[model samples]
Target: MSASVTVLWDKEIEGSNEVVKVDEMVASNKVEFYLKERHFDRTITHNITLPRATEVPIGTEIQLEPKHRLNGNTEPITFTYGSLESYTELSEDKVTMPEFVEPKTKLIVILTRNENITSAPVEISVGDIKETATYICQSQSGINAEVNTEPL
Candidate 1:
């Protein structure tokens, strides 16, 4: 029998262990079934909220934070606020995103491994298999920033 598989972010539990879901089995001399696992692969969506354009006065400092939904494991995640010219970093939970005195200041978010250099699209290896995903974070204005990561 042919079966389908699905992968999900376990938001309620911690750790990188696999939880297999057996969908259906076909009976023969031995039974065969379909199993689902994360395959050492996953994606995280960074949903961020910033003060509206008027929430803070021009040139005033503001704190912009991310409210990530995936929080079961102790994976070391880094968060950053950046623009084309500059960037500031913080841990996974939050950062004091700034509104600079400079004219036309804007911001984007970057996420990566905590110990990695300030980069994006971190590469992770599982066994002999390699998996890659984009390092992306979004803001209230729908601006998406892409980053790459390097070892420390």
Candidate 2:
């Protein structure tokens, strides 16, 4: 068995890129991509995160490939990963998390079959938008604490 991993952020704030620690034993393989300006070519990109009970062994080969488009362009391309090398990070402005995911949160995982073989790429999101942002106001004059409210 082999396990694959990828991470995506909810909000692409300045310096919002995250680095997920790889588990030496079970997580020897990983895929990394920067979610920045690459999105200018295409607004949609998919990332597969590691799951809760992912199973994999040492020397198991996993892979990461682009299915929708190539180089963030309008073409599809896929390739095998040798040595489980790391990729560059995308610009924060290019790929912003959908405003529902919390910062530094793990998203999903990609699992594969035996040895050096694997299936096509699959995507699993955070199920739902985790939470929304709330604006808070502080009372500088009378009240020590201000108000926390959600407006529509």
Candidate 3:
């Protein structure tokens, strides 16, 4: 039995998740795989914490909570936003929101993993499971009337 692994994320903040895969791992062969601790061209989509109608301040700092899934492993995978232009604490989990240069605009943020390989090989024992197993990461951005924005 052979196995496959995929990595997915939302490049567009609009909820479109893309996939990257590694194939040809036989049932007992050493499954070598990994993702570096850096940024890539791909983007993962996540929902906004606040509603679309709400408006925020010029230099508001919005919090982002990202989640992930890796090779059938549902664990908390932390990631950093790809750009420093619109985010603060780039090395940290939370994203510091930047000012909106335009009166009405959407603030976008992209998070990513760095370069690295699987620490060890993976093993798929039992079952004719020929499915797209993957590692996925995601985060959110939005303005909230009650929490994100302040009265001007």
TM-score of each: 0.20, 0.20, 0.19
Candidate 2 global lDDT: 0.25
Off by over 4 Å in 3: 1-14, 21-54, 69-152
**What's the lDDT of the predicted structure labeled candidate 3?**
0.26
- Which run of 10 residues does model 3 get worst, by summed lDDT? 22-31
Which stretches in model 1 have alpha-carbon errors above 4 Å? Answer: 1-29, 34-40, 54-152
lDDT per residue (tens digit) for residues 16-97 in model 2: 2323221111111123322211222212233222333433332333333443222345432221123332222232223232
The CA lDDT of each predicted structure is 0.26, 0.25, 0.26
Candidate 1 whole-model C-alpha lDDT, 0 to 1: 0.26
Residue 57 Cα positional deviation in candidate 1, in Å, after optimal superposition: 9.2
